[PDB]
């Protein structure tokens, strides 16, 4: 039933029912308060007077007449002020004449809408008829002019919106605008082709180079899934090239439940694609790019854990600024085969390998490695011991030798090390408010016979990073060619402060120094934290009878609140290679750097982010940054400007500037240069849906 609270109603039985005096229509679930009403039983309609303040489930509508039809719910109001609500989000609209077509279809003419609340609305998209539909989430908006502030900032004769959470094909995903050498701008045009695959062409300009066409594809199937990013630009204006490009590829394939086959690819045109129009992380993992292919295996499920994979790799190394590249080797085949099983207590670990390194500036030559190790373990209740008996067996075959390099070699180096150390636990030397103090000693002793293996070339071996964990490794040169001959007794002691209620580490110490069969060095470290604030991380690498110190480092970082961070970090070291001089001998010099970071709200509504990486060896900062973010009531601003002046070459500095604009419930967050100072939590609106939100209901 639909009861009316009006005391007096002019009507005989059915033809007309006229009610006045702030009447109501029950219609369970939809209140309807108005001023007066008239009926006429000809099309079963309802007119709701002059004020018409409806309110049903969070959408207060205030119109003029609202001539409903109520047979298929065809309504027609005036001056509607629609404010729909929903869990987490909302919309506001001031239309001139709302319509209604059947169910879930509107024709809302002459609007002025925003996702913001009432008042001097910071922004709104005034327009003509907006035919929002529910069967298709495509709300056309004829003659829409995006206003901001008090002046229109845009204009179109036709526009669409994704009215729900679907994958909107054909939407031009926003824009990216920011630069120094020009005003380099790019506008992507995503256009979905099928549920599985969707290429996104993005035309662009650089303002100083030319025009780019960086687009990408991204497919998917039951088994094969991959992406294919790329870029290309015709004749350049500042450098002089004409056809530069870049390509990427993933294609993670599956054959049958055991064999993957992934193709990791990356290739640029010249030795200067990065460092020209790329970010500040071109420093690492971008001096030599990757190109791979691999397979796999695994199982046998019966006293075995086989694995394999025939990798084929050939890096692409870039020059720095004048054409000086190192160009490491290239692995054409690689027939790895690992193993692992357990004999109850003992633990057999076997291996194998094969690799042909092809090169031009240096000699080629296949090889082979068999490392059948066996490591028993014994931990009774307190302290562990674990011996081991391996047998390293290399065998080279190098051809086209230019100088002196034995045509065929072969070695066997029986590796025998005995790792094991006890453990102590104590509660009497605690420092805090109820912590538990653990002190733990341990040892190591590895025996490896000696040989003369310096006439064999250095294909892939490299000396390992000397730290605390280094004392407990059975190979200094962490590779395969050079295996040192050692007879040492690394001695260590490490202490962990563990909480009195749970077992979260609060602080960890340690120190160790490997003997010989003496000292030649010292290694200490300490890293912990009293929680969120007063975090600390340090290290050292001392050597006595020779000099003061090799490579000490220090750290810090205190968080007063969820933001307000002030992280800082030092780093020292002598004889550190810098910039790869002409011949190939790296410039050797001593480091002294101190990077400072912060993100400290300067004003109730303005935050700041700052980075600064100083270098005392030359009295010039390596990298520096400065930003500023904003917020308001309707996400009116959500504006962030970020400026960075990094270094690219030995001398070539190159600055840049960035912009970011955010509106409530229609934007996106994530477009940042790289992973900067630790947290850098954004200081503006979530902005999930990126357009038109998700809900539309009467």
């Amino acid at each position, epitope marked *: 039933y639909t009861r009316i609270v009006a005391d007096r109603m002019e009507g005989q039985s059915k033809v007309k029912v006229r009610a006045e005096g702030s009447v109501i229509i029950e219609r369970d679930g939809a209140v309807l308060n108005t001023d007066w009403a008239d009926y006429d039983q000809s099309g079963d309609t309802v007119t709701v007077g002059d004020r018409f303040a409806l309110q049903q489930d969070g959408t207060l509508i205030r119109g003029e007449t609202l001539t409903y039809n109520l047979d298929q719910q065809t309504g027609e109001a005036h001056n509607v002020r629609m404010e729909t609500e929903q869990g987490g989000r909302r919309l506001q609209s001031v239309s001139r004449t709302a319509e209604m077509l059947g169910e879930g279809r509107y024709k809302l003419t002459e609007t002025q809408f925003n996702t913001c609340s009432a008042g001097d609305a910071g922004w709104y998209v005034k327009a003509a008829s907006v035919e929002a539909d529910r069967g298709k989430g495509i709300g056309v908006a004829k003659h829409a002019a995006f206003v901001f502030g008090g002046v229109p900032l845009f204009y179109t004769p036709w526009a669409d919106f994704p009215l729900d959470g679907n994958r909107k094909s054909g939407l031009l995903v926003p824009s990216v605008s920011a630069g120094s050498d020009g005003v380099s701008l790019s506008v992507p045009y995503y256009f979905n082709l099928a549920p599985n695959f969707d290429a996104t062409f993005a035309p662009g300009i650089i303002g100083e180079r030319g025009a780019t066409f960086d687009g990408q594809i991204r497919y998917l199937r039951p088994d094969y899934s991959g992406q294919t990013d790329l870029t290309w630009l015709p004749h350049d204006k500042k450098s002089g090239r004409n056809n530069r490009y870049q390509a990427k590829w993933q294609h993670r394939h599956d054959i049958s439940d055991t064999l993957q086959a992934g193709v990791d690819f990356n290739q640029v045109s010249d030795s200067g694609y990065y460092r020209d129009f790329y970010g500040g992380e071109e420093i690492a993992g971008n001096v030599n790019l990757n190109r791979r292919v691999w397979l796999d295996y695994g199982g046998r499920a019966a006293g075995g854990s086989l694995n394999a994979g025939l990798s084929v790799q050939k890096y692409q190394t870039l020059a720095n600024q*004048s054409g000086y590249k190192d160009e490491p080797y290239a692995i054409m085949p690689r027939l790895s085969a690992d193993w692992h099983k357990n004999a109850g207590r003992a633990q057999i670990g076997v291996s194998a390998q094969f690799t042909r390194f092809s090169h031009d500036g240096r000699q080629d030559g296949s090889r082979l490695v068999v490392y059948p190790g066996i490591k028993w373990d014994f931990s009774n209740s307190w302290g562990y011991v674990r011996p081991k008996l391996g047998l390293h067996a290399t065998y080279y075959s190098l051809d086209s030798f230019g100088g002196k390099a034995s045509r065929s070699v072969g070695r066997v180096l029986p590796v025998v090390n005995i790792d094991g150390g006890t453990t102590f636990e104590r509660n009497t030397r605690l420092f805090g408010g109820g912590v538990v103090q653990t002190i733990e000693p341990r040892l190591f002793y590895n025996y490896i016979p000696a040989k003369s293996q310096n006439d064999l070339p250095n294909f892939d071996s490299s000396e390992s990073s000397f730290g605390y964990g280094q004392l407990f490794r059975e190979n200094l040169y962490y590779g395969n060619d050079r295996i040192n001959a050692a007879n040492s007794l690394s001695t260590a002691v490490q202490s962990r402060i563990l909480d009195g209620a749970t077992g979260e580490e609060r602080f960890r110490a340690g120190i160790g120094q490997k003997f010989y069969f003496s000292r030649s060095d010292w290694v200490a470290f300490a890293s912990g934290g009293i929680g969120g604030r007063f975090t600390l991380d340090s290290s050292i690498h001392y050597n006595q009878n020779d000099k003061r110190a090799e490579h000490y480092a220090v750290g810090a970082g205190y968080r007063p609140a969820p933001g307000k961070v002030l992280n800082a970090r030092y780093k020292y070291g002598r004889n550190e290679k810098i910039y790869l*001089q*002409a011949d190939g001998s790296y410039f050797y010099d001593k480091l002294s750097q101190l990077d400072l970071s912060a993100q400290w709200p300067l004003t109730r509504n303005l935050s700041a982010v700052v980075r600064y990486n100083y270098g005392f*060896e*030359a*009295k*010039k*900062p390596i990298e*520096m940054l400065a930003g500023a973010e904003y917020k308001s009531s309707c996400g009116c601003w959500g504006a962030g400007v970020y400026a960075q*002046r990094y*270094v690219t070459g*030995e*001398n070539t*500095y190159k600055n840049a500037v960035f912009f970011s604009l955010q509106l409530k419930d229609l934007s996106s967050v994530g477009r940042n240069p790289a992973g900067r100072m630790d947290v850098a939590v954004p200081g503006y609106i979530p902005a999930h849906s990126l357009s038109a939100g998700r809900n539309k209901r009467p």
Partner: nanobody
């Protein structure tokens, strides 16, 4: 910081001269050095530059074969050796260094020297 040059004076066309740029106030051992010149009443043009170790050099295409730039990281001084001089060689030479500030954005020009080769 401060840079001062030396060695200006009058020499006939076909003469020789080596100007010195005694730099001080900062770690010269790590920065490029740019030698510039500005004829009296004309536009300031580029002459030559030196690398950090003196290993690499760039010369202006108009000054090739007649000039050679050298540097010395023991007195923070660089030298520009000139031979087979001509009437058009006369200018005011400036020692210039770039990106040496707290922000790596400053430049500094010396007081300059006067080299006049007459007709």
């Amino acid at each position: 910081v401060q840079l001062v040059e030396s060695g200006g004076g009058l020499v006939q066309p076909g003469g020789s001269l080596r100007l010195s740029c005694a730099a001080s106030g900062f770690p010269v051992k790590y920065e490029h050095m740019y030698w510039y010149r500005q004829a009296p009443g004309k536009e300031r043009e580029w002459v030559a530059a030196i690398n950090s170790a003196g290993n690499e050099t760039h010369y202006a295409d108009s000054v090739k074969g007649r000039f050679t730039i050298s540097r010395d990281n023991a007195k923070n001084t660089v030298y520009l050796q000139m031979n087979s001089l001509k009437p058009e060689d006369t200018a005011v030479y400036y020692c210039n260094v770039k990106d040496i500030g707290w922000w790596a954005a400053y430049d500094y020009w010396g007081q300059g020297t006067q080299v006049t080769v007459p007709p």
